[PDB]
Design a protein around this ligand. Structure first.
Ligand SMILES: *CCS(=O)(=O)N1C[C@H](C(=O)Nc2ccc(OC(F)(F)F)cc2)C[C@@H](c2ccccc2)C1
Ligand SMILES: *CCS(=O)(=O)N1C[C@H](C(=O)Nc2ccc(OC(F)(F)F)cc2)C[C@@H](c2ccccc2)C1
Lengths: 144, 97, 97, 147
């Protein structure tokens, strides 16, 4: 048992970084525009590209499109990849992330990459990054 | 190995904020979290252990305050991000050959 | 030092299992998670970074399977723990002077 | 200047308190299974945290009132000469709730006592919560790496 054990990261490819970037939402959701998200998308694209990731960006996908695209990436072989990265830049509600038109259960999205659904990522890191509010409380400042 | 893995193992969930809180942004330059994440990825992405880097992200975001906002009760308010690790090993992004 | 802290910063929530899952135990010797946590605390508590140690706990618990249980559908089932860090620095428990 | 190797200050007079809430049995009308072997977990955590310099305070099968009084008390004593705070729950849970002997408590009510605005002497210091509890009704399934 080696306390210093590292994930094997000497595969042919680093792997895919999926970025779902949501700037505007279906009018009847009454969700504010996410001005500055495109800077975040571009910034994450440069940074993950420099770490060897194949960065795949999708802007303002509706629920059907987002679910098709992420299912697709879950079903391609990651056998020659180090890891998988998935970024959501959007609004959230409880355990849900918003697409353009509707919210999706985050567990439906991570569930596609669990060992029983995605054999080629078994033993490999699955990293989810979520820029979204997780409620309606501002945290308050304090001093040493 | 001799051993099987749980199907839920080797997940890392990196959140801009802890459950129940608002996340914040600069006017048009992007979110606090992604800006600080990207800065730490630029400086340290290729050397530091990833969760070690996400801890630096937590410290950088913790230093920010809301200076301007339409909701005046948000002014001076704060944010700490939160990462949830089900990882079983050290995670490095050393440059690939 | 110049900056304020969020009131929610410097919390570390260490869970036996990720949200939505059952946790497991030996017959009467205690829980998988606390047994493995305590073993890692015994070997590494005073030297390793605490989240680095909790990652070892995740690997140790991930190696276990249910051998005996009254619910036969639990037999051969698995567990990964989950820690959620809002920490802003490295956490060590070096021996005190 | 930004030091990536920065550690929490851990050279205070005391390491600090480790609170252990150990729940083996539950009020009959909760219909919750007994947690036989939890006392081994409690004792094991007590030895390990004591060896790291913690003042370990254990409480067995407290009812909601007792647990809330005890944890409020520890939240209101000075930790100014302590490195950190540790709080262990060995019990059953439901959503964002931990079970006392007789009833469930919102976990956020318990962690909320140690937030910087409620507990000034732990501002800048680690607050570590450890929870041995099921978080749902799904078993995780075994898998093997693709060779
Ligand atoms: C001063 C308040 S705010 O920042 O306009 N806003 C906080 C919160 C929100 O939506 N924040 C947010 C953070 C990061 C984002 O990504 C980015 F685009 F890259 F910047 C986008 C948005 C909640 C907002 C709100 C407004 C009205 C009603 C409820 C909540 C306010
Ligand atoms: C064979 C399944 S079980 O372990 O008997 N059990 C799983 C779960 C549970 O209560 N787990 C659990 C884990 C660690 C514990 O700490 C310890 F006591 F120190 F060991 C205690 C308990 C749910 C159980 C259950 C039983 C009846 C109805 C629903 C759920 C079964």
């Amino acid at each position: 048992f080696d306390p210093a054990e590292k994930y094997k990261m000497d595969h042919r490819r680093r792997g895919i970084a999926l970025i779902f970037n949501h700037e505007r939402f279906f009018w009847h959701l009454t969700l504010p525009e996410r001005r500055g998200t495109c800077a975040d998308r571009d910034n994450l694209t440069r940074r993950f590209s420099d770490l060897g990731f194949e960065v795949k960006c999708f802007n303002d996908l509706k629920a059907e499109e987002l679910l098709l695209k992420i299912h697709e990436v879950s079903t391609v072989s990651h056998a020659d990849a180090d890891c998988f990265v998935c970024v959501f830049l959007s609004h959230g509600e409880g355990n849900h992330i918003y697409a353009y038109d509707a919210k999706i259960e985050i567990q439906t999205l991570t569930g596609l990459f669990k060992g029983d659904k995605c054999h080629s990522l078994v033993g490999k890191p699955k990293i989810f990054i979520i820029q979204a509010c997780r409620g309606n409380q501002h945290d308050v400042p304090v001093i040493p | 190995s001799v051993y099987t893995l749980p199907a839920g193992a080797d997940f890392l969930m990196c959140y801009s904020v802890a459950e129940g809180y608002y996340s914040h942004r600069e006017t048009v330059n992007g979110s606090w979290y992604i800006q600080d994440l990207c800065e730490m990825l630029g400086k340290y992405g290729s050397s530091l252990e990833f969760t070690e880097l996400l801890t630096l992200v937590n410290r950088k975001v913790s230093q920010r305050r809301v200076d301007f906002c339409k909701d005046p009760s948000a002014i001076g308010k704060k944010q700490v991000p939160c990462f949830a690790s089900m990882l079983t090993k050290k995670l490095h992004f050393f440059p690939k050959s």
